[PDB]
Amino acid sequence: TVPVYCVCRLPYDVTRFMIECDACKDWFHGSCVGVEEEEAPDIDIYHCPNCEKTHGKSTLKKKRTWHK
């Protein structure tokens, strides 16, 4: 056996974006849990779908300008 990850329990494939849940510290493919790689810089706290129930929804944090 080898290290496996995510809800799909697969070995690490370097061609796939992955994100680590801040609550359980496990790794998930963005495509398996609905997170796109381009969205990750805006995530302040990521909770996977399981951990959302015990720890609450993920939090986004980003900068914004409004007048222009």
Binding site: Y12, F17, C21, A40
Partner: peptide, 8 residues
């Protein structure tokens, strides 16, 4: 969060 970027 920690991430692993998609590679080629």
């Amino acid at each position: 969060p920690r991430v692993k970027a998609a590679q080629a």
